[PDB]
């Protein structure tokens, strides 16, 4: 056994990042040992979610009957170092022919971040190799002429920014600080935010790109010298924790924090001591979607480079109760690909014409016209490869460490964002 590899009639590549490491100078052209770096529990959960999805589909006698799905999965803690695993999915017999017009895999799920996706997508786009991202929210990926085989199952930053503006307009504060991760995710958020508020009462009073030795003492020094009460923190788990943890440390108080869905469901910060001190945390969040059978799969599961977890001794409970965000996206990504395969093969409800030549670009054509139900949602993508499913909600971190829903974002309504203000208890 390896969790990272499962034989089958057809292979899906799985691009994940189970560990985190900061960028560092290197002098040799070789893969990084990711397995000795800092473990990320909610990422591992998303990893398992894909393994659960493939096993469920292989258990099924109506979706892809008698045609098994396998996978090659990777843990890419570093974008610049992920190319060996990329070459494996794209290779024909462990060889890449640059000028080629049957790759190892028929599609790939992931990656999770805009940065990973920008570094590798071109190699996939050249032959219309389907990438279905479960987390990459960069605006640029809606440009179909640049990324014509790139689909995703989460929404663009545009939407999330709209939702975040919706929250601000619903209340009375109009000076805003905007702290963003010093990367493509963050930077793209800042431009979507600036665009959306140009024609409004909202004024961007302060912004800073957030990185490793951001002097948080001095960021918070100006923020309170400009008397800003509202602070948007648009960043990944690692950067967000830095910001919030520094805030408690520097005793920043009486602020309204606004989170994107990357950390509105953080399970560390709400239980953190002193959290109460910094004011009130609201955010845009993905509603918890219940994926049935996943709990049982986890209990049963806890028992080439970048294909090692190095994570025995895991509390099954701590994985189950980890940040469930992006779960349905991963789930749907795998199913989107399985349905495309199913339809390319021209399967029936109990049989599949056997041993057929499938080409990744045929999967793309079936992927794009995806239209099927899954847990009573409808899985479809628009002309940009963006998803026409998934809600956002507004949460409030309440006195007992829970992210209580207090509102909804409606993509196509007159009042775009609605909030039961009485549920919010203000610190």
């Amino acid at each position, epitope marked *: 056994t390896s969790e990272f590899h499962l034989r089958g009639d057809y292979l899906i590549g799985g691009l994940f990042n189970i560990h985190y490491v900061a960028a560092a100078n290197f002098q040799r052209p070789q893969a990084i040992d990711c397995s000795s770096k800092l473990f990320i529990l909610p990422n591992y959960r998303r990893f398992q979610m894909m393994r659960f999805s493939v096993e469920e589909i292989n258990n099924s006698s109506s979706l892809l009957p008698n045609v098994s799905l396998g996978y090659q999965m990777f843990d890419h803690c570093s974008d610049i170092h992920s190319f060996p695993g990329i070459f494996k999915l794209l290779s024909v017999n462990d060889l890449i022919r640059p000028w080629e017009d049957l790759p190892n895999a028929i599609g790939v799920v992931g990656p999770f971040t805009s940065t990973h996706a920008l570094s590798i997508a071109p190699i996939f786009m050249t032959n219309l190799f389907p990438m279905v991202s479960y987390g990459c929210s960069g605006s640029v990926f809606s440009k179909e002429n640049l990324y014509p085989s790139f689909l995703r199952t989460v929404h663009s930053n545009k939407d999330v920014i709209n939702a975040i503006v*919706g929250i601000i*307009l*619903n209340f*009375n*504060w*109009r*000076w805003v600080a905007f702290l963003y991760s010093d990367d493509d995710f963050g930077k793209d958020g800042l431009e979507q935010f600036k665009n959306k*508020i140009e*024609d*409004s*009462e*909202i*004024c961007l009073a302060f912004y800073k790109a957030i990185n490793v030795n951001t002097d948080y003492l001095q960021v918070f020094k100006q923020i309170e010298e*400009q*008397n800003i*009460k509202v602070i948007v923190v648009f960043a990944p788990k690692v950067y967000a924790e830095a910001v919030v943890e520094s805030a408690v440390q520097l005793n920043v108080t009486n602020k309204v924090w606004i989170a994107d869905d990357g950390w509105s469901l953080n399970k560390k910060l709400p239980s953190m001591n002193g959290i109460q001190n910094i004011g009130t945390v609201l955010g845009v969040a993905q509603p918890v979607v219940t994926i049935p059978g996943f709990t049982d799969f986890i209990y049963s599961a806890i028992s080439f480079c970048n294909q090692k977890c190095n994570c025995s001794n895991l509390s099954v409970k701590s994985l189950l109760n980890a940040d469930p965000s992006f779960s349905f996206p991963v789930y749907a990504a795998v199913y989107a690909i399985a349905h495309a395969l199913h339809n390319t093969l021209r399967c029936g409800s109990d049989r599949c014409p056997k041993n057929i030549t499938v080409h990744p670009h045929m999967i793309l054509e079936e992927l794009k016209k995806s239209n099927f139900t899954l847990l009573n949602q409808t899985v479809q993508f628009d002309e940009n490869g963006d998803p026409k499913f998934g809600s956002l909600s507004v949460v409030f971190w309440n006195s007992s460490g829970n992210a209580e829903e207090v509102g909804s974002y409606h993509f196509q309504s*007159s*009042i*775009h*964002l*609605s909030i039961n203000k009485t549920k919010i208890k203000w610190f």
Partner: antibody, heavy 124, light 112 residues
Framework: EVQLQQSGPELVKPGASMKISCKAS????????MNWVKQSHGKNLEWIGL????????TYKQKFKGKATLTVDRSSSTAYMELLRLTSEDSAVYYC?????????????????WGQGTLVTVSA | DIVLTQSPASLAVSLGQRATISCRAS??????????MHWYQQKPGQPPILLIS???NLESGIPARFSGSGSRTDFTLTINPVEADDFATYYC?????????FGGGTKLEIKR
């Protein structure tokens, strides 16, 4: 150009009610508070209240609670003030005015754009 | 409710000379490092025009002969030099606190 175009002068009977419109153009309607201001002939300016066109939230000066009702219609970019149970004390020029950009709050915002005004005459 | 008292009530200033209008507020109108006092010009039969916001910021489109200053509770609008189309009522306005309130106005007349 930002323009606020108010509805024409009205003559209305005592005890009746009346509705004034403010058509906004040339900016994004839901991003700025719409304020309403009264001016009796004596020419004191009085703030009636404001509405957040994004969600319909309203704030009123206490003496106009249940006198004035502010609403918006987002699809036509139009703000309305309904005046209830009219008396001769309600004969005045009424203005709609848009919050500008730069105030820390919706409360502190000043008025950069005004409609031309609506003269209301309350008489039998 | 913050009460605004302008002085003088009315004023006559010769062309090319300086006009000084005052506003005193019952309570301070300071917050967020600013003074939320603004000045408007209203010619007869027309909506008020914003001249100066937050006590001293000249709005775009307004000549530099209009200016304002002061803080806390005491504010001055200054017009120098007065030109012929400057007769109007000038209203100060505070927005520090709900409800917003206007001063009673100061009536500026051209002396000739």
């Amino acid at each position: 150009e930002v323009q606020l175009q108010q509805s024409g002068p009205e003559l209305v009977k005592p005890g009746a009610s009346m509705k004034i419109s403010c058509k906004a153009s040339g900016y994004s309607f839901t991003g700025y508070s719409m304020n309403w201001v009264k001016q009796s002939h004596g020419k004191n300016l009085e703030w009636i209240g404001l509405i957040n066109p994004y969600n319909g939230d309203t704030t009123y000066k206490q003496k106009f609670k249940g006198k004035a009702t502010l609403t918006v219609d987002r699809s036509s970019s139009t703000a309305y003030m309904e005046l209830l149970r009219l008396t001769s004390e309600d004969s005045a020029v009424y203005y709609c005015a848009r919050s500008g950009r730069g105030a820390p709050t919706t409360t502190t915002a000043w008025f950069t754009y005004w409609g031309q005004g609506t003269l209301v005459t309350v008489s039998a | 409710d913050i009460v605004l008292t302008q002085s003088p009530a009315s004023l006559a200033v010769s062309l090319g000379q300086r006009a000084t209008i005052s506003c005193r507020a019952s309570e301070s109108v300071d917050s967020y490092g600013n003074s939320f006092m603004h000045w408007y010009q209203q010619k007869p039969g027309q909506p008020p025009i914003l001249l100066i916001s937050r006590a001293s910021n000249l709005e775009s489109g307004i000549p530099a002969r209009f200016s304002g200053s002061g803080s806390r509770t005491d504010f001055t609008l200054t017009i120098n030099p007065v030109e012929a189309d400057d007769f109007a009522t000038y209203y100060c306005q505070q927005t520090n606190e709900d409800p917003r309130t206007f001063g009673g106005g100061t009536k500026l007349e051209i002396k000739r």
